[PDB]
Amino acid sequence: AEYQNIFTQVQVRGPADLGMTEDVNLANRSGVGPFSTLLGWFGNAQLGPIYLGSLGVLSLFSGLMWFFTIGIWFWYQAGWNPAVFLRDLFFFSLEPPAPEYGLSFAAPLKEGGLWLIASFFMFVAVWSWWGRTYLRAQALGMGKHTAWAFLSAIWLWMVLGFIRPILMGSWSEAVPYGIFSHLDWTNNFSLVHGNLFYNPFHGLSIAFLYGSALLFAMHGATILAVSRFGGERELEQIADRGTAAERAALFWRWTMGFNATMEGIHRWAIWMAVLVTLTGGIGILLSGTVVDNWYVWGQNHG
Amino acid sequence: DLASLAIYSFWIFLAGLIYYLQTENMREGYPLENEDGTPAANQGPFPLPKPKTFILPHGRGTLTVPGPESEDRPIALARTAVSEGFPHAPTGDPMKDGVGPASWVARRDLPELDGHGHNKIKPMKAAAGFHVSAGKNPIGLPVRGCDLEIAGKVVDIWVDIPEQMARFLEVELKDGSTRLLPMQMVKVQSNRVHVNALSSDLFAGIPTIKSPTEVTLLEEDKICGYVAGGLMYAAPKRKS
Amino acid sequence: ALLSFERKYRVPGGTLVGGNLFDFWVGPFYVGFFGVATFFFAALGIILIAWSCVLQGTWNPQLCSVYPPALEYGLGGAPLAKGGLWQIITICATGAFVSWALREVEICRKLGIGYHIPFAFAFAILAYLTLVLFRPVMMGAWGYAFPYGIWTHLDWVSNTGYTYGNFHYNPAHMIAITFFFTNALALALHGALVLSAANPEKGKEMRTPDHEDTFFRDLVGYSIGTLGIHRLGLLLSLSAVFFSALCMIITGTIWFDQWVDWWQWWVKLPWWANIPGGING
Ligand code: BCL
Ligand code: BCL
Ligand SMILES: CC[C@H]1c2cc3[nH]c4c(c3C)C(=O)[C@H](C(=O)OC)c4c3nc(cc4[nH]c(cc(n2)[C@@H]1C)c(C(C)=O)c4C)[C@@H](C)[C@@H]3CCC(=O)OC/C=C(\C)CCC[C@H](C)CCC[C@H](C)CCCC(C)C
Ligand SMILES: CC[C@H]1c2cc3[nH]c4c(c3C)C(=O)[C@H](C(=O)OC)c4c3nc(cc4[nH]c(cc(n2)[C@@H]1C)c(C(C)=O)c4C)[C@@H](C)[C@@H]3CCC(=O)OC/C=C(\C)CCC[C@H](C)CCC[C@H](C)CCCC(C)C
Ligand SMILES: COC(C)(C)C(=O)C/C=C(\C)CC/C=C(\C)CC/C=C(\C)CCCC/C(C)=C/CC[C@H](C)CC/C=C(\C)CCC=C(C)C
Ligand SMILES: CCCCCCCCCCCC[N+](C)(C)[O-]
Ligand SMILES: CCCCCCCCCCCC[N+](C)(C)[O-]
Ligand SMILES: CCCCCCCCCCCC[N+](C)(C)[O-]
Ligand SMILES: CCCCCCCCCCCC[N+](C)(C)[O-]
Ligand SMILES: CCCCCCCCCCCC[N+](C)(C)[O-]
Ligand SMILES: CCCCCCCCCCCC[N+](C)(C)[O-]
Ligand SMILES: [Fe+3]
Ligand SMILES: [K+]
């Protein structure tokens, strides 16, 4: 049996790594957490420390509030019967205001006002969280890629629950909170609009989602394949190419006639993934605001 | 109609993006060369991108790419046909010569440093607080080559400090000298560490490092390249 | 043409079949025995597909389609125009994809690298065969396989899924989707992290892997490591295609009713099945 580097053979542990300092505010960093021998087989074993400043607490609070708001309604829908709670757990649904209330906030609590409160906490959670992925990178002197990539996923989430409902003039259009309900909402929207396979942006979005799986398989296979040459240390192979980089380049050259660099493969990456939700949110935003029936739109644009 | 303008626009953006990406990926190994290193006539349809420069940390200088490309070492290979596109036979011991799967790159002959500028990789015995914490401790085990002969004992683990992993085994040979063996290229078993890539006789072959408590990016590549090349080149003396 | 570092790697050896006969390059493409196999399978196939698209009578990409044989033919043969060409083009594709794969194993040997890539590749080959071979052969017909058509194959997906209602309700489809979403998530985050390190604020030194680990630990309280994330992204996208094969292999064989009903087994668990309240009781 040849070793394939999928799982660790010998874990070694040193003192806790408390991380680079640069301009990070250390007053706001927690202590190191526990050390999971479990994790260490696949990844790193050290949990913590976490940075938690003002902006993190705001986000970490709003999120719990959005989760709890949904959750209380879920207990209620279960008639406070813990057994029913578990049984119908995927069937509960916090639902948005009925269309007669339009975009207003007047709708009663138990008929949408609760969805609008839970959605507020979500808005504040996600967005202040975005501020976190920026300020953390700024704090270490690094770029804002992580932040711009997030902004792409935010864009779909923003179109589903905010921009399209407002453009469509009513909170009723927006997605409910609940396992099965959100699933049926999806398959519904597809039927209301003429089968989304006829939407060129759904088709595109899918392509990238497939392509993200293809690429990360490709990339992660390749870096494990050349890990016997220190391949996984991509930053220093960028500053100073190695045989790892060379043979990884030359695998895909001799297979498909072209290849990447150790830094280039990560721009392929960041964009294949980011275009998933980028095209994805355009396909939704156009749906019902501009195009009513993708099928019918495809009959006159194709 | 808005939708069709958007989808037409997107496709144009995407071609520009592919172009942008494909050039950005030509910052290394270009421009393409004939088998004698002269510039190649057909360079494909993509232009070299404008040079970018990296500011390496710890006063290690810069890198500017794309730049002059040079192998910066002799290559013991020679043509096997009279026309382009065929293998190139080694002219000595490809293992000793670092050609083929035995190949190494002329990386800087300094060691990689952590973010506080200490050497990234140390032996454990010289790494305060580091110790094995899960799975078999290989230190002390006999190291067996692919010819099923014993070639050395494990006298330390060479560990990455900021990542906290094992990165080499340090093996002591019959003459008392060690070598380093990439961790991803041994199987730590309960009574032995097995090395399928090398046969015992080839263990002294392994390039040797110059300091006992550090290893440079160059010394890594000659050690890793050699072990890996053993896969193809030892095979006359690989059993089962 | 070679790369400014390529020649030293272009040694002989590594082949699985036929020695040094096909052991050469063609441009940047390595050939080998399985480079030839691929080309044959991939060429014969693409030929039969353009000539299947006169038997249908159509020379448009948005219209060319090679449908499987009809359910009536079961699992046997069928005339070329009535399903035979699909059956051939399907064998071709299998040969081409298994050829592309073994060809990759040779390229792996000659480079002294590990076989992780054409092993990852196998999962895609296996999902494909699941849809065109394994699943049709337990349901008893090639007509349960999909057509070879840019838009018709999309039809089949809608037609197939809706046979079982909203296909969302498939529990293995669910787990597939979850890995796929997590993969894109891991891909975005991975690309950006590397990139924000090599490409920091203006005029700054390159950030180190320490700076990556610090960034995530600062942000989510964990950081998986630079070896882990490559292990992850491989596992996440392989997993997703595994449960894709699975979600389809169980569908039409061991489960063939509306997938939404599969979930009663939970709701109808006896310790709470007739408790009043909530949606179900
Ligand atoms: C039967 C139903 C319809 C259908 C209806 C829809 C609809 C409607 C939509 C999609 C969407 C998508 N569909 Mg479709 N889809 C169908 C068939 C398919 C098939 C298939 C094999 O048939 C595939 C492969 C896909 C694939 C896809 C994806 C490419 C795309 C979503 C990208 C994404 O990642 O979103 C996942 C990412 C997000 C939702 C963003 C989330 C971002 C926020 C910021 C995260 C917040 C987290 C929160 C704070 C909680 C934190 C958790 C705690 C940490 C624990 N669909 C059929 C045709 N599909 C979307 C799209 O773009 O369509 C154009 C969409 O809206
Ligand atoms: C009406 C639509 C139904 C539905 C019905 C189905 C059906 C039906 C199926 C799926 C399957 C899938 N669906 Mg579903 N699904 C729906 C809703 C969704 C939504 C969503 C947001 O609503 C999402 C995200 C998904 C997601 C997915 C994935 C779990 C999976 C697709 C990946 C896959 O199989 O890869 C596998 C990848 C491959 C098979 C590709 C193999 C590539 C080969 C080996 C190489 C080819 C080379 C090529 C020819 C080269 C050309 C030349 C070169 C380019 C030069 N579905 C709705 C409810 N879903 C599929 C599945 O699980 O299949 C196993 C499937 O069949
Ligand atoms: C390229 C697009 C892909 C992508 C990108 C992406 N997502 C991102 C990022 C990026 C680049 C971030 O920067 C950010 C991040 O930090 O990731 C680590 C994020 C992120 N993507 C997230 C999720 C997410 N991304 C998704 C999708 C994807 N994101 C796309 C496929 C999906 C879906 C629907 O597929 C989900 C569910 C989060 C992990 C994070 C954004 C975090 C956020 O907004 O947090 C605010 C909320 C809180 C701080 C508290 C929330 C309360 C929670 C419910 C937990 C507490 C309750 C309980 C104790 C546990 C709950 C879970 C169950 C066991 C109950
Ligand atoms: C398993 C994880 C993911 C994955 C991985 C993966 N794919 C891979 C690899 C790996 C590891 C490769 O090494 C290999 C490669 O070269 O990648 C660049 C490949 C690859 N995956 C590809 C495609 C692909 N992968 C996909 C998916 C995925 N691939 C998974 C999500 C998808 C989809 C639908 O999501 C597609 C389209 C190719 C780019 C390439 C394989 C190249 C190959 O096999 O070449 C030989 C064959 C030909 C050149 C042509 C053959 C033509 C046929 C004989 C006739 C056509 C038959 C076909 C059935 C008709 C289809 C009709 C459609 C309209 C529906
Ligand atoms: C155990 O019980 C306790 C009580 C402890 C619990 O906590 C139980 C908790 C639960 C059972 C919760 C389980 C949670 C869920 C099932 C939630 C599932 C969530 C989803 C399926 C997400 C669906 C998609 C949601 C979208 C697309 C949202 C968009 C949000 C908007 C972008 C926000 C827009 C803002 C609005 C509408 C407010 C307007 C006002 C402003 C000021 C901006
Ligand atoms: C996604 C994984 C999340 C892991 C979050 C772990 C945060 C670590 C906090 C540890 C706190 C240490 N201490 C002693 C101050 O409590
Ligand atoms: C995303 C985290 C994944 C954690 C999974 C841990 C899997 C345990 C497998 C370890 C293998 C044990 N052993 C003895 C082979 O080393
Ligand atoms: C913390 C939430 C911030 C306020 C925004 C939420 C709007 C909710 C409206 C509730 C409606 C109350 N009422 C009586 C009209 O039903
Ligand atoms: C960054 C990598 C770029 C890869 C581009 C993927 C091409 C997919 C095109 C599929 C056609 C989709 N559509 C909507 C026109 O039907
Ligand atoms: C975009 C989807 C389909 C694209 C087809 C494959 C692209 C061919 C890339 C191979 C390039 C080989 N070449 C000519 C550069 O030597
Ligand atoms: C769909 C993703 C693949 C797009 C193909 C992009 C072009 C690759 C061809 C690069 C040219 C190779 N060459 C000639 C420079 O060696
Ligand atoms: Fe990587
Ligand atoms: K020690």
Author numbering:
A (entry chain M): 1 to 302
B (entry chain H): 11 to 250
C (entry chain L): 1 to 281
Can you list sentences taken from the study reporting this PDB entry?
In three mutant forms V(M84)C+G(L278)C, A(L53)C+I(L64)C and G(M19)C+T(L214)C (pairs 1, 2, and 5, respectively), in which the introduced cysteines were close to the protein surface, disulfide bonds were formed regardless of whether these amino acid residues were on the cytoplasmic side or on the periplasmic surface. According to the data obtained, the mutations made for the formation of intra-subunit disulfide bridges (A(L37)C+S(L99)C, A(L172)C+L(L246)C, and A(L53)C+I(L64)C) did not contribute positively to the stabilization of the RC but, on the contrary, had a destabilizing effect on the structure of the complex. However, the cysteine pair L53Cys-L64Cys (pair 2), which formed a disulfide bond, had the least destabilizing effect on the structure of the complex compared with cysteine pairs that did not form S-S bridges.
The photosynthetic reaction center (RC) of the purple bacterium Cereibacter sphaeroides (recently renamed from Rhodobacter sphaeroides) is a photosensitive membrane pigment-protein complex that serves as a convenient and informative test model for studying the mechanisms of electron transfer, photosynthesis, and pigment-protein interactions. The RC from С. sphaeroides consists of three protein subunits and ten cofactors arranged in two membrane-spanning branches, A and B. The RC contains two bacteriochlorophylls (BChl), PA and PB, combined into a special pair P, two monomeric BChls, BA and BB, two bacteriopheophytins (BPhe), HA and HB, two quinones, a non-heme Fe atom, and a spheroidene molecule. Of the three protein subunits of C. sphaeroides RC, M and L, are pseudosymmetric with respect to each other and have 5 transmembrane α-helices, whereas subunit H has only one transmembrane α-helix, which is mostly located outside the membrane on the cytoplasmic side.
